[PDB]
């Protein structure tokens, strides 16, 4: 039994000082085993926050990350699932579903997760799974004006991912769940 936290595009402090309060309260140490971050937490401060939440943190370089180390793309395994990590600004068109599945084919991952759209999407196509948390802080996006802060955590059982999506719709946190089992 393992649960991981996938979140990105915090944009602190370019467009966001910090996360939403209810979010800040729901993320506590100990519960989260792994952390997969996609977007650009533009400063190492937020990186040490993500290292507060869990021990194994995996980040990838975004377009606005001033850091010196984050890789452009990473493929990490959790249990038995092959997970692919990429911010998503090299996946042109940015929100193209058909372009993302191509990255899946090149990567040969069972779950490919990306961001840079600030729009949360979780779907299964060609028996593969694609997740985009969006901005945990609901940052600014030039293409979308009604942005909803969100994050996703997946509890990889054994050849079975259940993904829960938290969203700050209005004032209270509304959650949804999508499930996927290995091909």
């Amino acid at each position: 039994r393992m649960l991981v936290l996938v979140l990105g595009d915090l944009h602190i402090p370019h467009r966001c000082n910090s996360l939403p309060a209810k979010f800040k309260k729901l993320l506590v140490p100990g519960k989260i085993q792994h952390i997969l971050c996609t977007g650009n937490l533009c400063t190492k401060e937020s990186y040490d926050y993500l290292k507060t939440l869990a021990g194994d943190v995996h980040i990838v370089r975004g377009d606005f990350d001033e850091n010196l180390n984050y890789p452009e793309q990473k493929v990490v395994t959790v249990g038995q699932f092959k997970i692919g990590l990429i911010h998503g600004h090299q996946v042109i068109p940015w929100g193209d579903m058909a372009s993302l599945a191509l990255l899946q084919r090149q990567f040969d991952v069972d779950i490919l997760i990306s961001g840079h759209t600030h729009k949360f999407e979780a779907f299964e196509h060609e028996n593969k799974f694609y997740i985009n948390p969006g901005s945990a802080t609901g940052a600014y996006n030039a293409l979308e004006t009604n942005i909803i802060p969100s994050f996703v955590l997946m509890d990889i059982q054994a050849s079975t991912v259940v993904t829960y999506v938290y969203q700050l719709i209005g004032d209270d946190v509304k959650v949804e769940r999508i499930e996927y089992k290995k091909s």
Binding site: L26, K31, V175, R177
Partner: peptide, 7 residues
């Protein structure tokens, strides 16, 4: 709904 966290 359920949660590995809080409600």
């Amino acid at each position: 709904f359920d949660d590995p966290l809080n409600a």
